[PDB]
Write a protein that binds this ligand. Structure first.
Ligand code: YAM
Length: 261
């Protein structure tokens, strides 16, 4: 019996408020009778037609992605109220996780998380899917060994955005590359906010001068250089995610070798 019956899903606490509506914690009983902990995304009753269409449109994309480092959609109940049943990652947001665990985390782990997210982005890049919300608030911790890229950006996060996105509202895989490097900066900074010392209006001017985020204290120089390549003003000069996977794999190996693991 393929698909998901509503009776197979029991809701518990509210987890929070997403763009379309409330997200609940719950339990899904699958076809083997196993109890699976789930995050259940809902759409507000009083929302516009275009918002409902978009809720379902994004869900169908997520249903077709099956990547170890992208949040997993388990199923969709289309009949109103429409529920999108996701896998629950109870550790929650990576930014908060990093803050909490900063005194036990090794640099090799921070590079691992970067690499994992990079792998997900390399897959999206292969189908010219532009994500727009690659940031530690939108990465989920499945386990200490595994992070997952969250839902696509509602697209204002000026301090994460490429120059062309700020200047022209242009979003491409290369602007995702820019944002991914900002995410890496956040990770290596244990979840500090990029340009916390500036206001939004000031950013593009600084970026136009060639000024960039400074190297985080624990960031290996080799990795900082890679970040600065991602922040090339010209989108065409930025590495592609497929290139970054190879580069980050090498950085990861080096950090593991230095840590003797
Ligand atoms: C809480 N919300 C979220 N905030 C940030 C990212 C993701 C979500 C919701 N989505 C998910 N959330 C989780 N887990 C999760 C999250 C946030 C916390 C916790 C768990 C415990 C906690 O304290 N905060 N696991 C899987 C998913 C999913 F669907 F993407 F697969 S919200 C504002 O209601 O949208």
């Amino acid at each position: 019996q393929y698909g998901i019956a509503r009776e197979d899903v029991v809701l518990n606490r509210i987890l929070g408020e997403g763009f379309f509506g409330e997200v609940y914690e719950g339990v899904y009983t699958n076809h083997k009778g196993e109890k699976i902990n789930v995050a259940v995304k809902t759409c507000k009753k009083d929302c516009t037609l275009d918002n409902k269409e978009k809720f379902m449109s994004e869900a169908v994309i997520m249903k077709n992605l099956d990547h170890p480092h992208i949040v997993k959609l388990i199923g969709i109940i289309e009949e109103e109220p429409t529920w999108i049943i996701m896998e629950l990652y109870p550790y929650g947001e990576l930014g908060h996780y990093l803050e909490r665990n900063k005194n036990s985390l090794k640099v090799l782990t921070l590079v691992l998380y970067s690499l994992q997210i990079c792998k997900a982005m390399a897959y999206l890049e292969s189908i010219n899917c532009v994500h727009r919300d690659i940031a530690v608030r939108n990465i989920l911790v499945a386990s200490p060994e595994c992070v997952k890229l969250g839902d696509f950006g509602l697209s204002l996060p000026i301090k994460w955005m490429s120059p062309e996105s700020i200047n022209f509202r242009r979003f491409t895989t290369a602007s995702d590359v820019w944002m991914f490097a900002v995410c890496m900066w956040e990770i290596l900074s244990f979840g500090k906010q990029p340009f916390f010392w500036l206001e939004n209006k000031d950013v593009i001017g600084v970026l136009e001068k060639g000024d960039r985020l400074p190297k985080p204290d624990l960031c290996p120089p080799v990795l900082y250089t890679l970040m600065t390549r991602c922040w090339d003003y010209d989108p065409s000069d930025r590495p592609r995610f497929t290139e970054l996977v190879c580069s980050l794999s090498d950085v990861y190996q080096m950090e593991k070798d230095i840590a003797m693991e």
